[PDB]
Design a protein around this ligand. Structure first.
Ligand SMILES: Nc1nc2c(ncn2[C@@H]2O[C@@H]3COP(=O)(O)O[C@H]3[C@H]2O)c(=O)[nH]1
Ligand code: NA
Length: 120
């Protein structure tokens, strides 16, 4: 369900990110075009610490909080990219991300991201 206005929102979210804003505009456009919706019910984990990363996400609606074990670190601001660290640095997920309310995201698969990155 991704129209002109939603693509602008995703584009602007991606360009907030210190890494992604250094990408070519076409690479950002590719990311947006290749993203798909993933929604999560309150209580579910989007990301679990120590797992391999398989997506980059943009938060589109709802509340997401970041934890390391039982320690609460942050609430992810709306229309912000997350889950980029494990993908960009090939470390495991640095922290868990949990849906505090029902959440909507736009997701990009790792393999598609890596395909886009290779046009650098
Ligand atoms: N470690 C950490 N990750 C955060 C924080 N806020 C948001 N995040 C995001 O949560 C993500 C969890 O997966 P990644 O480690 O791959 O990438 C992480 C960041 O994008 C924070 O305060 N600490
Ligand atoms: Na920890």
């Amino acid at each position: 369900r991704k129209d002109s206005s939603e693509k602008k929102l995703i584009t602007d979210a991606l360009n907030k990110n210190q890494f992604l804003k250094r990408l070519d505009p076409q690479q950002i456009k590719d990311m947006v075009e290749c993203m798909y919706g993933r929604n999560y019910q309150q209580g579910s984990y989007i990301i679990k610490q120590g797992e391999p990363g398989n997506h980059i996400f943009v938060l589109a609606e709802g509340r997401l909080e970041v934890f390391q074990g039982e320690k609460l670190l942050s609430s992810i601001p709306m229309w912000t990219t997350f889950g980029e660290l494990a993908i960009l640095y090939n470390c495991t997920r640095t922290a868990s991300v949990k849906a505090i309310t029902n959440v909507k995201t736009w997701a990009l698969d790792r393999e598609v991201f890596q395909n886009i990155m290779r046009r650098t």
